[PDB]
Amino acid sequence: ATRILLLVLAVIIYGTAGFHFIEGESWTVSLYWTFVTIATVGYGDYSPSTPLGMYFTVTLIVLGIGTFAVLVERLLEFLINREQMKLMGLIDVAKSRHVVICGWSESTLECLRELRGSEVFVLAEDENVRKKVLRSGANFVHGDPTRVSDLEKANVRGARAVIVDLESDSETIHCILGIRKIDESVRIIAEAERYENIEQLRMAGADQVISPFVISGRLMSRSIDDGYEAMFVQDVLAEESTRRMVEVPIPEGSKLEGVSVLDADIHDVTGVIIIGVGRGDELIIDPPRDYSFRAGDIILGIGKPEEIERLKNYISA
Amino acid sequence: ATRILLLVLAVIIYGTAGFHFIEGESWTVSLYWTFVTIATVGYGDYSPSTPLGMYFTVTLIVLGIGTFAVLVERLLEFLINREQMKLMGLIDVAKSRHVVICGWSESTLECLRELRGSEVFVLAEDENVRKKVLRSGANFVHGDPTRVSDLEKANVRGARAVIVDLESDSETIHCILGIRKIDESVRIIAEAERYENIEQLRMAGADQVISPFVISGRLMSRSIDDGYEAMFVQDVLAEESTRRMVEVPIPEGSKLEGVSVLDADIHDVTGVIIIGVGRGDELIIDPPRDYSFRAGDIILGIGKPEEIERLKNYISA
Amino acid sequence: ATRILLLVLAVIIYGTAGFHFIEGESWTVSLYWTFVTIATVGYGDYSPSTPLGMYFTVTLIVLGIGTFAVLVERLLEFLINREQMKLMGLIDVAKSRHVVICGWSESTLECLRELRGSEVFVLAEDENVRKKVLRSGANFVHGDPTRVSDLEKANVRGARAVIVDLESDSETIHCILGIRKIDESVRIIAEAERYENIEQLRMAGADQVISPFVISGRLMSRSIDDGYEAMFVQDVLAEESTRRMVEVPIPEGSKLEGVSVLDADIHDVTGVIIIGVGRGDELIIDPPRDYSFRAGDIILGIGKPEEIERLKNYISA
Amino acid sequence: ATRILLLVLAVIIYGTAGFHFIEGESWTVSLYWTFVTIATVGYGDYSPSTPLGMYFTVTLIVLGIGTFAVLVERLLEFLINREQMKLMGLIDVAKSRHVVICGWSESTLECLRELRGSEVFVLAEDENVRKKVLRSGANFVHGDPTRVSDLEKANVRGARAVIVDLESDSETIHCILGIRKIDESVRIIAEAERYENIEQLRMAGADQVISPFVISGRLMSRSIDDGYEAMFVQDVLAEESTRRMVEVPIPEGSKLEGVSVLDADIHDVTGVIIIGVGRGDELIIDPPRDYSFRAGDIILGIGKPEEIERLKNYISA
Amino acid sequence: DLEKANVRGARAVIVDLESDSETIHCILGIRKIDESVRIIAEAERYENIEQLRMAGADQVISPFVISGRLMSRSIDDGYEAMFVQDVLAEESTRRMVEVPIPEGSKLEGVSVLDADIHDVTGVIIIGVGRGDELIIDPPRDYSFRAGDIILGIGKPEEIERLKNYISA
Ligand SMILES: [K+]
């Protein structure tokens, strides 16, 4: 790989040792003339005069052209190899705050619209998935999400969060186990098809589990007659037509520390229905009137975009 | 992406600030000498004389070669990426009067022979379809005809007309709905397999619907005994052996405005059987003898190539 | 496609019209200086002296570098397109004495070992067939053997002979009909699976028909008890272990014109069993003793390589 | 392929014969000037003065640029062809001490972790296998392991050892027969699925046969109640948790030649259970107390990594 | 569908599916039904051997892991693979047997050094499994008990010579 460097150094030395070993001009001007001749710069300050000397000049010119040809050849081969290799995946990830996505479905396409295109890496192995991901605007890594060896290629260790949605619950569980084998602190978000596997996904190590099929089946099984819960669910979580479920935190101080919910009256002040207060990875749905707010708490509620703004400004210090 | 421009500007500045900061020749000739040295032009009008100066010349030459190498590398990488990307589709369309074709069957191959090869764009996603389209002489765009996002890549908004012929009537209806979601005025031409979907294609928004299977089934169901309607249909619409169904418009004035059909006697004058007169997106089959011709009307008839010429010249002003 | 030629001519003109329109040296030396400056040759005989003139030199150098970049870009794009296109087929054939092979099976692989690798063209459309053909040492053309349009890409018109062996007898018959539609004189060699299609292949236009399955089934149906005909067939036609069925023609004169078979006694003279004499596309198996030899006749017999040599030298003039 | 060399020699001759046939300077300086002009070196010592002469210089410059373009074109085409061809296999092997692997399964992936990545060559034909092998870190050769023609591409003749593990026992037997057809001395290591084919693999020519399915079935059929043999087998051969089955040879002399096992007491001295002594391709399990050690014998035993070290140092001279 | 096969009451369950993911899922499902049934699983990859044991498998078999290592050593020597094949796969001449110690057996409390099972019968004693643990190469101070299982390799003749020898 470094043989070409030795070859070109030999040619440069061979050239330099021609002037001094022929006309004996100067051991310093020979070094220069050899460098200007190879780079075709051709000043012409010091040109040969003997027939032997000018013949040696032709030999040096053709040898320099031959060396350049090999130089260009090596580079071109390297560029072709790199481009051909990194086009179909087979490239290690060097980032440290990306988002790794295992598998590609319609659920992972909808979360790509709220995430940066250059920070998400999709880890699959199908060929059509590569084209779909490239059209979507993400980066494709060729590997098996269930393999620990291919999980380190995607740099799961340093990822901000990992989203697991594979073709089957068995594969999802295996991928979660593999990720937890690498990093025990990375955040994992999984999707469950069957109701039986919701607890197994949580036991494997998933931080958050989503059950779209379980939600949709129950919504279908109640909308045959009434169809009012499904309407609320659709208009609040799917379309966000008018209202929206927001989660706004409480800043430092906020002039609302220690104030109870009964004295705050967030509904009567802003118009946002307070569902619960999440204090440190636990959701207290419908907190009592005796609950006291703190710093860093997150308020979960449903309201219009106007009322959400009315609340975020209201809880400011 | 523009780091190389800064690097080369730094090298040029570094070179220029060598003459003045070493030999102090001239702040204007230094700029020149640095440019002729990098482009290997090597005039030689102003060559260095000090050993330090000629060493700096070698340093500048090798640095310029290194900069050129990176320059060539970047370009080559860009060209490889562009060619590799636009070979398999994944390219947005910038035209504004093309013809978009969704799907690829034998029906869309026969309409390619009467259309310009460079104005038709085929929107599919199969790999064999790409080779078939390239052999036919059209442009291939990789996308799903049913997706509104992939429909905008083909630039349906600005297309002259869109031809929809997919693998199923469900896909055809979905594609028509998607196209009408983008543009409500573009002309859509669809093909229907089942007789039940002819009305659904028209309700979705298709301007023209063609039912080859419905026509062929009825032709088969009558040719068991007689086989005379099928012979006429084949020899007039499929082969155009002797006669042909032509639609010639009436130019401005044409010396035939207000003249009734009974007084015109187009059959007795030219020999072309007049089927109907299309006046503004409606076909009046067998117009009455009291019908009065106008300007911009289209005459639909069946005749030999000789009689068609005899009629087009007859209706001229 | 020729815009770059206009651009470079404009740059050359712009350069040439600088010397005369600035320093007014000579309308002939300006043309020269502009050509030596672009090709980085840089003699230096006529270098600028005014600051404006040397600035214009830098402008010309950078413009020439920009023009060269586009020049290299266009070429590279053309080469990439050509290589990428002619790698997967999609290339028209310009030869006029090649051998076209439709389909790829084990039968067409055994006939490749007795034919020149560079004269055979294989016309298929599967991807694995391309790799198999390339490993074998032939040229691959991507097309459908049943399509007349793709048959002209392989240049069947000018082919020496066409060998048809497709996946089914229906496809073989269709390909023969298509070839006969193009050229009514080219030689077609087909292979038949079923016994019912031997006559249909000959009616379609095939010059020679081979029935390996029909031969093998009958050989199997007789070797259950005796197995002596199959042994002869294998050892003479498949392996050519000891003997071989040869067909040697009769040269001009040959000192054997008009001599009857009874007076020639080819068996008693050389040891080759004379099966038949093919005189003008007809095989006379076991010719009578009254048959008279002629010029241009072909002798069909089975003999050892020694006896074949003994006969070819015997029938020489 | 060598036409370009003739073309460039013609251009060089044409250039050289310009000076002497025009200005008649010198038959030696013309050769030089032609070489410096083509390589754009442009010294300028001998520049033309006549208008005709300087026109001829422009003609030579443009002809040299045209020749260079073709030169670059040919090289680029060669590099593209080489890279495109050797990327998907289709490359002959020139090594003489590699390890050829036929087929790719989980068994051949585990033996890649104890072998050098650059000496193993995998011979398959599936496309996914190529990506798997490239990710693993080996070299991929595209061919059919059952074909003798594709077996010579992998250079089985000169291989150190061949490992055969295909999708079926029929394919494994066929590959072994093909390899033995090429080389009768190369070492073959095969894997058997069925118990019926263990003897057929040995009769075909396999030096060593492995039966993972046969071992696992019997281990399953005994672990239903006891499960103690399977525990030993797993912990000694699969995981090598604590102990390990080692095979250490006896060096020259070793101070243990002719010493009987009863007097050596290898178990009482080191702690390694002596299973057997392999003397020349035969395993003597549980050798008698009267057995006498020799030179070049291999000791097979199970022991901890400490006891193995205690034994290897003990048997040293 | 696991309850249709009546896994609850099964004597033992053998899990060998098309993939390690499916094997792990099946083991988890079986352990969800019955926490005491005996599960015997098979592992393809070396990474999943520990995950199968954590899921609840009582015994794990790694045929691919064994065969890969046997292939990776038989390129030059090929003596360990020969022993493994002839003892575990074909059982040509010898065989690895596991014979228990009956009640009393006239060998309770007798140390291995005083028993000398190799010098008496000819069977190489690999280890003694006392209650779901294998003591490979027990010390000379080990004392036999009742219900222990002796693991060794010997000919069918020597196995008979040992089973009759350890009888009361
Ligand atoms: K140059």
UniProtKB/Swiss-Prot annotation, chains A, B, C, D:
One of its GO terms (cellular component) is plasma membrane. A motif (Selectivity filter) lies at residues 40-45. Pfam families: Ion_trans_2, TrkA_C, TrkA_N. It is a multi-pass membrane protein. Residues 77-87 are cytoplasmic. Gene3D superfamilies: 1.10.287.70, NAD(P)-binding Rossmann-like Domain (3.40.50.720), Regulator of K+ conductance, C-terminal domain (3.30.70.1450), Voltage-gated potassium channel (1.20.5.870). GO terms for molecular function: identical protein binding; metal ion binding; monoatomic cation transmembrane transporter activity. Residues 30-39, 40-45 dip into the membrane without crossing it. InterPro entries: K_chnl_dom, NAD(P)-bd_dom_sf, RCK_C, RCK_C_sf, RCK_N, Trk_Ktr_HKT_K-transport. Keywords: Calcium, Cell membrane, Ion channel, Ion transport, Membrane, Metal-binding, Potassium, Potassium transport, Transmembrane, Transmembrane helix, Transport. It is not known whether calcium is the physiological ligand. Inhibited by charybdotoxin (CTX), a protein from scorpion venom. The channel is composed of 4 repeated units, each containing a transmembrane pore part and a gating ring part. The gating ring is composed of eight identical RCK (Regulators of K conductance) domains, in an alternating arrangement of one domain from each of the four subunits and four from the intracellular solution. Two protein interfaces between dimers of RCK domains from the pore-forming subunit and from the intracellular solution hold the ring together. One is called the fixed interface and the other the flexible interface. The flexible interface forms a cleft where calcium binds. This is Calcium-gated potassium channel MthK. It comes from Methanothermobacter thermautotrophicus (strain ATCC 29096 / DSM 1053 / JCM 10044 / NBRC 100330 / Delta H).
